[PDB]
Amino acid sequence: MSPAYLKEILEQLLEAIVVATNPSGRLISELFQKLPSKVQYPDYYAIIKEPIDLKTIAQRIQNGSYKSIHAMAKDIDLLAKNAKTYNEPGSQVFKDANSIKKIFYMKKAEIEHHE
Numbered sequence: 001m002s003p004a005y006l007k008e009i010l011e012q013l014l015e016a017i018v019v020a021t022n023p024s025g026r027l028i029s030e031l032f033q034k035l036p037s038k039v040q041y042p043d044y045y046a047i048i049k050e051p052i053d054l055k056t057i058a059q060r061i062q063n064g065s066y067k068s069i070h071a072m073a074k075d076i077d078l079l080a081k082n083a084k085t086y087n088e089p090g091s092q093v094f095k096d097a098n099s100i101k102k103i104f105y106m107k108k109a110e111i112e113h114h115e
């Protein structure tokens with residue numbers, strides 16, 4: 001894939017995450033756009049050694065930093081793992097983190113397998 005072709009795929013994957021809603025209409029990605037304040041949420045940075053958010057992933061797409069879909073996927077996995085480490089299982093944030101992963105990998109398969 002050329003860098004320009006790869007970028008279009010990565011943009012479509014991120015878009016699928018950012019537009020996803022639950023049956024009640026809530027944008028499940030909203031909380032993950034921007035990392036919490038280091039001033040107001042210092043425990044997050046004591047616990048999470050490699051913080052990442054969707055804004056950072058979007059910038060990496062614009063910068064061409066990802067050389068494969070897999071590289072973006074690993075950053076999505078890290079975002080979700082961080083959220084699932086900081087938040088209790090069955091909490092809304094924990095569930096939404098898993099939902100972001102499920103959306104990403106479903107969309108990746110739809111793109112990569114379609115013929």
Ligand SMILES: Nc1nnc(-c2ccccc2O)cc1N1CCC(O)CC1
Nearest residue numbers: 031032034035036052053082083086093
């Ligand atoms: N409980 C949270 N867990 N994760 C995050 C979080 C954000 C972006 C990327 C990854 C993440 O893991 C943000 C959280 N809260 C934001 C709102 C605040 O009021 C309380 C903290």
Ligand SMILES: [Cl-]
Nearest residue numbers: 069070071073
């Ligand atoms: Cl992958």
Ligand SMILES: [Zn+2]
Nearest residue numbers: 069070071073
């Ligand atoms: Zn992979």
Ligand SMILES: [Zn+2]
Nearest residue numbers: 111113114115
């Ligand atoms: Zn097709």
